[PDB]
Amino acid sequence: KLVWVPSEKHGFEAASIKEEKGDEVTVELQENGKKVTLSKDDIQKMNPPKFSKVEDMAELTCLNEASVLHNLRERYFSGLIYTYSGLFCVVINPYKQLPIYSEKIIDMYKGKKRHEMPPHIYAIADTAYRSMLQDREDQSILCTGESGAGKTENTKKVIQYLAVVASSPYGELEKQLLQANPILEAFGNAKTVKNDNSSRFGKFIRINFDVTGYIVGANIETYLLEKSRAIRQAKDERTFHIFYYLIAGASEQMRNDLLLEGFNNYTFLSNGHVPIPAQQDDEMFQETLEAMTIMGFTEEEQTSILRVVSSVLQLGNIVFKKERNTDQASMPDNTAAQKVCHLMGINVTDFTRSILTPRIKVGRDVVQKAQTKEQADFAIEALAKAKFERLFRWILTRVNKALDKTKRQGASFLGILDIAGFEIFEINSFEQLCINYTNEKLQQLFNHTMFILEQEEYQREGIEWNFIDFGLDLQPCIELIERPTNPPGVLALLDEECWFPKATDTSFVEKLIQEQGNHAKFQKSKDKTEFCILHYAGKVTYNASAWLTKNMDPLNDNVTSLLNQSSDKFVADLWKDRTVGQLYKEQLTKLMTTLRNTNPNFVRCIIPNHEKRAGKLDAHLVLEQLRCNGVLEGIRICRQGFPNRIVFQEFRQRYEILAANAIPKGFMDGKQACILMIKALELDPNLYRIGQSKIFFRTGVLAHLEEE
Ligand SMILES: CN(C(=O)NCc1cccc(F)c1Cl)[C@H](COC(=O)Nc1cc2ccccc2cn1)C[C@@H](O)CO
Ligand SMILES: Nc1ncnc2c1ncn2[C@@H]1O[C@H](COP(=O)(O)OP(=O)(O)O)[C@@H](O)[C@H]1O
Ligand code: BEF
Ligand SMILES: [Mg+2]
């Protein structure tokens, strides 16, 4: 007499039905004994105890939100962070070190089928690896989820599994491969209120393989680096790890060399020295230097990199005042300009002139215009973000150079996506639009993949599949963001608005209301810069402040030129060289085109709590992520159809006891044997469907069968 009822504290909770009266049901909570009257439709059927901590939730007889949630909860507290959810995988961040990632465990998963061993990331990495050789098709592992859910941690475990199994211990390439993320994270990761090691970029790591299956090379593409983090940070947050590593670690000689001057003497360090618990910045600096040594970065490359990190900071120490009774920019103190110019290998007078009085061509004449304090601050800020992303791109292209040095492309690859998941913030700027546009494509991919896997399964069994593409639901929303013309999208109207002379951020929004106002996935807010978009996971209020500027990404042409002709060979290489929106759409088209031609493996990461705590599972927050992931839409769709499918030999062996009379003494066909057991059970012909190898059942039909 036990059931699942909705719970404000636990999401769902065990309770027993004491009295029924039509739709009204009076339950008694199996925790505190408190009486609760609620509707029959809020009540959720509970699974037999033989399903306690079930490794694959597709095995559940009663498929419901309450049963799935409890299955993940039971596993999580038993130390079990991995759970298979039929066609995809779920990972709940333990926030503690688990002993599941040793050399013994790697060897145990070598060539094992998904069902042959307990759930692990190693098994996803192995099944995709074996399939790549067997089927001769490219693979992908998609580690999705919120900030601090476990995307980076899992992505790296796939790398360390494959660097062991697909090795030619480890070997120069595999040793270097394991150093890519230590380097990239030093420059692209930061301490955030959500994650002490948040990825402030997204990546798709492509590992290349020999016909035999040996790692032959690798390439990494990065997306959306938060270059604005170099300038200023929110309360209790840090810039990229590298500034703290360098300042904390650098030798007495290095400090003097690169003109480094402590945590409190830099404006680009908004909160001074903020520490990362259980981590020392000086230790991490040595750990980063070591990784760059393994990757083959010469001491000169290492030192020129730290010299750029130092100049990025100095830029954010230059102070502009105003000439008396004018808006005109003045630099009364040359101290910072001199220090940064010594580092950038450029002339200080030529730099000062390039920031305060830049020469601009008008045709045919050239206007030397004096800048306002505001324009010069924007120019120095714009240049510091631009230098930093150009330093990340250089470090990245050098890592790729080290990792594809063999001039070998292989017969196949295994792509590993680790990009930022959907998150609604207080301010959702142009970057959030791009991140949320990306997830509209990654969720359409997942939805459509499940739709193909099922369409193919239903066809094999010869059972009727009356469903339209599950990916098509996310299509109008995408068309509101991309779509070049007929109704032009959000980005298309931005690109067009950036060309208008008098154009403003409000101007852009007014034009957006005028063009997309009555679009299904559009809503007017309630501020003249604000607008809403109804994404798969939820309504997001976007603020269009400085988007026109963000899409244009302007830099002072004069200083970029000086840097292009720097006396320092490295700085010169950085500045060796149309919209931000158009360029990102290209990156996403190219990534989606890649992913669409690989067999995808989904690894849905779940954050247990917003506290960064071990053994604390926030039920309603885990529920909120399964909704967002598509898990709850999945539970619904499979409830609608046939969730339980059993093979004839397994149906007979499992339920021989009940229909004892139906099976006559002798040899008989599997399909034939079951028909008679089904007929003896007097099962409704709407509840079942006989397939070519498995019997398809509606939800709770097999639960009824579960009796002794
Ligand atoms: C019946 N089924 C299950 O795995 N049921 C458990 C389950 C489904 C969904 C969310 C869940 F939590 C859970 Cl436990 C297997 C194939 O069915 C799927 O997996 N479809 C599916 C469709 C979706 C459609 C839209 C959005 C998400 C979706 C997710 N998924 C087939 C199995 O017999 C063999 O693996
Ligand atoms: N499987 C795991 N085992 C141990 N710690 C983990 C695991 N997954 C995540 N963590 C913890 O969570 C933190 C955030 O993980 P991270 O992968 O960087 O998140 P994100 O999904 O934002 O990339 C890590 O610093 C670590 O403490
Ligand atoms: F913090 Be996650 F890596 F976006
Ligand atoms: Mg990450």
Tab-separated table of N, CA, C and O in Angstrom, residues 201-249:
chain	number	residue	atom	x	y	z
A	201	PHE	N	35.348	29.269	-21.365
A	201	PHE	CA	35.312	28.920	-22.786
A	201	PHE	C	34.613	27.561	-22.948
A	201	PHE	O	34.421	26.839	-21.971
A	202	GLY	N	34.241	27.234	-24.174
A	202	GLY	CA	33.664	25.944	-24.519
A	202	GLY	C	34.604	25.267	-25.478
A	202	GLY	O	35.303	25.959	-26.214
A	203	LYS	N	34.669	23.928	-25.471
A	203	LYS	CA	35.578	23.215	-26.370
A	203	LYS	C	34.989	21.939	-26.979
A	203	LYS	O	34.080	21.320	-26.421
A	204	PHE	N	35.555	21.542	-28.124
A	204	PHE	CA	35.265	20.308	-28.831
A	204	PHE	C	36.615	19.710	-29.121
A	204	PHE	O	37.348	20.215	-29.970
A	205	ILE	N	37.004	18.712	-28.344
A	205	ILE	CA	38.301	18.063	-28.519
A	205	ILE	C	38.102	16.920	-29.493
A	205	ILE	O	37.260	16.055	-29.265
A	206	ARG	N	38.848	16.922	-30.591
A	206	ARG	CA	38.777	15.865	-31.587
A	206	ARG	C	40.051	15.003	-31.475
A	206	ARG	O	41.142	15.497	-31.763
A	207	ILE	N	39.924	13.739	-31.023
A	207	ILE	CA	41.065	12.804	-30.960
A	207	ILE	C	41.061	11.963	-32.266
A	207	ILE	O	40.052	11.335	-32.580
A	208	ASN	N	42.173	11.961	-33.015
A	208	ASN	CA	42.312	11.238	-34.293
A	208	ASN	C	42.898	9.800	-34.145
A	208	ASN	O	43.830	9.582	-33.354
A	209	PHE	N	42.341	8.824	-34.915
A	209	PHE	CA	42.715	7.420	-34.789
A	209	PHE	C	43.057	6.713	-36.062
A	209	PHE	O	42.323	6.814	-37.046
A	210	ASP	N	44.135	5.885	-35.973
A	210	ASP	CA	44.721	4.923	-36.928
A	210	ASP	C	43.631	3.889	-37.231
A	210	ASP	O	42.783	3.641	-36.368
A	211	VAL	N	43.666	3.256	-38.420
A	211	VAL	CA	42.722	2.198	-38.838
A	211	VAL	C	42.627	1.099	-37.768
A	211	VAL	O	41.551	0.540	-37.548
A	212	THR	N	43.757	0.828	-37.081
A	212	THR	CA	43.864	-0.161	-36.008
A	212	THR	C	43.189	0.320	-34.723
A	212	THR	O	42.712	-0.510	-33.951
A	213	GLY	N	43.157	1.635	-34.511
A	213	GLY	CA	42.549	2.260	-33.341
A	213	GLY	C	43.529	2.934	-32.406
A	213	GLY	O	43.211	3.156	-31.234
A	214	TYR	N	44.734	3.264	-32.911
A	214	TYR	CA	45.764	3.930	-32.118
A	214	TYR	C	45.650	5.438	-32.269
A	214	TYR	O	45.466	5.911	-33.394
A	215	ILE	N	45.728	6.196	-31.133
A	215	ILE	CA	45.690	7.671	-31.104
A	215	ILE	C	46.809	8.139	-32.015
A	215	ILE	O	47.928	7.610	-31.948
A	216	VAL	N	46.489	9.035	-32.938
A	216	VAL	CA	47.470	9.447	-33.924
A	216	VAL	C	47.673	10.951	-33.888
A	216	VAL	O	48.728	11.449	-34.304
A	217	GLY	N	46.690	11.648	-33.331
A	217	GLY	CA	46.717	13.095	-33.191
A	217	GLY	C	45.484	13.629	-32.512
A	217	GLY	O	44.605	12.853	-32.128
A	218	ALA	N	45.417	14.965	-32.355
A	218	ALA	CA	44.286	15.665	-31.732
A	218	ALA	C	44.240	17.132	-32.128
A	218	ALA	O	45.276	17.751	-32.397
A	219	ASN	N	43.030	17.694	-32.122
A	219	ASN	CA	42.761	19.099	-32.400
A	219	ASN	C	41.704	19.561	-31.423
A	219	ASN	O	40.807	18.782	-31.124
A	220	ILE	N	41.809	20.813	-30.926
A	220	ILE	CA	40.854	21.442	-30.007
A	220	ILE	C	40.396	22.763	-30.621
A	220	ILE	O	41.233	23.563	-31.078
A	221	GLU	N	39.056	22.977	-30.636
A	221	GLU	CA	38.395	24.219	-31.036
A	221	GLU	C	37.770	24.757	-29.773
A	221	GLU	O	37.222	23.980	-28.989
A	222	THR	N	37.869	26.077	-29.562
A	222	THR	CA	37.285	26.770	-28.417
A	222	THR	C	36.238	27.726	-28.906
A	222	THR	O	36.296	28.185	-30.048
A	223	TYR	N	35.261	27.999	-28.053
A	223	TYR	CA	34.131	28.861	-28.363
A	223	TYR	C	33.940	29.828	-27.222
A	223	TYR	O	34.202	29.493	-26.064
A	224	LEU	N	33.519	31.037	-27.559
A	224	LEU	CA	33.145	32.082	-26.627
A	224	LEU	C	34.013	32.237	-25.354
A	224	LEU	O	33.533	31.963	-24.251
A	225	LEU	N	35.271	32.693	-25.493
A	225	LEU	CA	36.075	32.970	-24.306
A	225	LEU	C	35.563	34.310	-23.751
A	225	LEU	O	35.358	35.268	-24.501
A	226	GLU	N	35.300	34.333	-22.437
A	226	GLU	CA	34.814	35.464	-21.659
A	226	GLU	C	36.003	36.449	-21.502
A	226	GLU	O	36.541	36.619	-20.408
A	227	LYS	N	36.425	37.077	-22.613
A	227	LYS	CA	37.523	38.046	-22.635
A	227	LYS	C	37.279	39.278	-21.728
A	227	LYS	O	38.254	39.939	-21.334
A	228	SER	N	35.990	39.565	-21.377
A	228	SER	CA	35.590	40.661	-20.494
A	228	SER	C	36.040	40.417	-19.043
A	228	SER	O	36.167	41.375	-18.275
A	229	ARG	N	36.267	39.134	-18.670
A	229	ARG	CA	36.727	38.742	-17.331
A	229	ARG	C	38.117	39.314	-17.004
A	229	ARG	O	38.397	39.544	-15.834
A	230	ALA	N	38.941	39.597	-18.041
A	230	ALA	CA	40.268	40.218	-17.924
A	230	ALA	C	40.218	41.609	-17.291
A	230	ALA	O	41.137	41.949	-16.555
A	231	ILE	N	39.120	42.384	-17.555
A	231	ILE	CA	38.848	43.769	-17.126
A	231	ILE	C	38.291	43.925	-15.725
A	231	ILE	O	38.788	44.766	-14.975
A	232	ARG	N	37.166	43.236	-15.429
A	232	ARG	CA	36.497	43.301	-14.131
A	232	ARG	C	35.771	42.028	-13.790
A	232	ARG	O	35.365	41.281	-14.682
A	233	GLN	N	35.615	41.778	-12.480
A	233	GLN	CA	34.952	40.583	-11.951
A	233	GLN	C	33.924	40.950	-10.867
A	233	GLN	O	34.059	41.978	-10.177
A	234	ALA	N	32.883	40.092	-10.743
A	234	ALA	CA	31.804	40.180	-9.751
A	234	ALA	C	32.320	39.772	-8.371
A	234	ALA	O	33.385	39.158	-8.254
A	235	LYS	N	31.579	40.147	-7.329
A	235	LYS	CA	31.919	39.896	-5.931
A	235	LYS	C	32.267	38.404	-5.709
A	235	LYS	O	31.518	37.546	-6.160
A	236	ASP	N	33.430	38.133	-5.063
A	236	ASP	CA	34.031	36.837	-4.647
A	236	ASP	C	34.546	35.983	-5.810
A	236	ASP	O	34.826	34.784	-5.646
A	237	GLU	N	34.709	36.622	-6.973
A	237	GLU	CA	35.208	35.985	-8.177
A	237	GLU	C	36.611	36.483	-8.483
A	237	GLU	O	37.043	37.524	-7.967
A	238	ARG	N	37.307	35.729	-9.345
A	238	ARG	CA	38.664	35.971	-9.769
A	238	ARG	C	38.747	36.127	-11.310
A	238	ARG	O	37.817	35.712	-12.014
A	239	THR	N	39.888	36.670	-11.842
A	239	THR	CA	40.145	36.676	-13.289
A	239	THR	C	40.553	35.234	-13.606
A	239	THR	O	40.383	34.338	-12.764
A	240	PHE	N	41.159	35.017	-14.791
A	240	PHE	CA	41.664	33.708	-15.227
A	240	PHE	C	42.770	33.267	-14.244
A	240	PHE	O	43.429	34.122	-13.632
A	241	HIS	N	42.905	31.945	-14.025
A	241	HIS	CA	43.855	31.367	-13.058
A	241	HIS	C	45.268	31.866	-13.196
A	241	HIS	O	45.941	32.073	-12.183
A	242	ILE	N	45.702	32.098	-14.451
A	242	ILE	CA	47.067	32.484	-14.854
A	242	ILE	C	47.622	33.768	-14.162
A	242	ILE	O	48.811	33.781	-13.866
A	243	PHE	N	46.804	34.806	-13.909
A	243	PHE	CA	47.247	36.049	-13.255
A	243	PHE	C	47.636	35.772	-11.795
A	243	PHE	O	48.678	36.235	-11.330
A	244	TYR	N	46.839	34.951	-11.103
A	244	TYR	CA	47.090	34.546	-9.722
A	244	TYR	C	48.273	33.584	-9.665
A	244	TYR	O	49.114	33.727	-8.787
A	245	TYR	N	48.362	32.645	-10.626
A	245	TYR	CA	49.477	31.698	-10.723
A	245	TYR	C	50.777	32.482	-10.847
A	245	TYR	O	51.625	32.356	-9.971
A	246	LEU	N	50.902	33.339	-11.897
A	246	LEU	CA	52.077	34.171	-12.174
A	246	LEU	C	52.499	35.060	-10.979
A	246	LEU	O	53.649	34.947	-10.542
A	247	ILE	N	51.569	35.905	-10.434
A	247	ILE	CA	51.844	36.815	-9.299
A	247	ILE	C	52.294	36.028	-8.070
A	247	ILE	O	53.252	36.432	-7.425
A	248	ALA	N	51.615	34.920	-7.752
A	248	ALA	CA	51.954	34.112	-6.588
A	248	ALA	C	53.276	33.329	-6.716
A	248	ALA	O	54.093	33.350	-5.782
A	249	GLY	N	53.480	32.700	-7.879
A	249	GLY	CA	54.614	31.831	-8.172
A	249	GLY	C	55.944	32.383	-8.656
A	249	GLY	O	56.974	31.881	-8.202
